[PDB]
Design a binder for these strands. Structure first.
Length: 76
DNA sequence: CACTAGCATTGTCTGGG
DNA sequence: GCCCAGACAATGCTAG
């Protein structure tokens, strides 16, 4: 199989569909601009709106420990 | 034809101080 | 065990 990647955090879990939606609504905007828009929109969400994505990121974090128990993040 | 780095974001994590 | 500076998770075009 392929290399093991980091699990997605709450913002990244949410950004998957939202980036797609923004891209389709604004097909002239590059991903850098979309990212700036996504950052602001994520910050605008209230706690209740963020909750499912926060919860799903934690599930992904725990599952990553199960599927890849000896994984160690080694940046450079 | 094929590859590669860069861009931007939030949140999590690293090594070394 | 916090600080510092930064990598890297997804995305997909741009351009070399």
């Amino acid at each position: 199989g392929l290399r093991i990647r980091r699990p997605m955090n709450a913002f990244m879990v949410w950004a998957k569909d939202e980036r797609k939606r923004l891209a389709q609504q604004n097909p002239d905007l590059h991903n850098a601009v979309l990212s700036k828009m996504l950052g602001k929109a994520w910050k605008e969400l209230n706690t209740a709106e963020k909750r499912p994505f926060v919860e799903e990121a934690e599930r992904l974090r725990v599952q990553h420990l199960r599927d890849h128990p000896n994984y160690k993040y080694r940046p450079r």
